[PDB]
């Protein structure tokens, strides 16, 4: 899982 | 899963 | 799992 | 912005 | 900004 | 920011 | 800043 | 800062 | 900062 | 698991 | 600074 | 598991 | 400052 | 066990 | 400064 | 276990 | 365990 | 066991 914010 | 907001 | 915030 | 419930 | 609720 | 209930 | 609640 | 509870 | 309680 | 404030 | 619990 | 907050 | 109970 | 604030 | 309770 | 803080 | 506070 | 405060 991966849950990214940039 | 990949959930992102760049 | 990777939750990441940039 | 992520606001995420599951 | 990542508020999660799992 | 990084706000986590799991 | 990381709020955490496991 | 890190504020933690597990 | 870190405040840890495990 | 990586949780990642940067 | 390191407030910790255990 | 790896918690990072810089 | 390190403020420590085990 | 990695919790790190820099 | 090390205030410690084990 | 690590807990650091710099 | 290596707690670290720099 | 290694509680360090520099």
């Known amino acids: ?3 990214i914010n940039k």
Do not use: G
Request: glycine content about 0%; charged content about 0%.
């Open 1 to 3: 899982v991966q849950i």
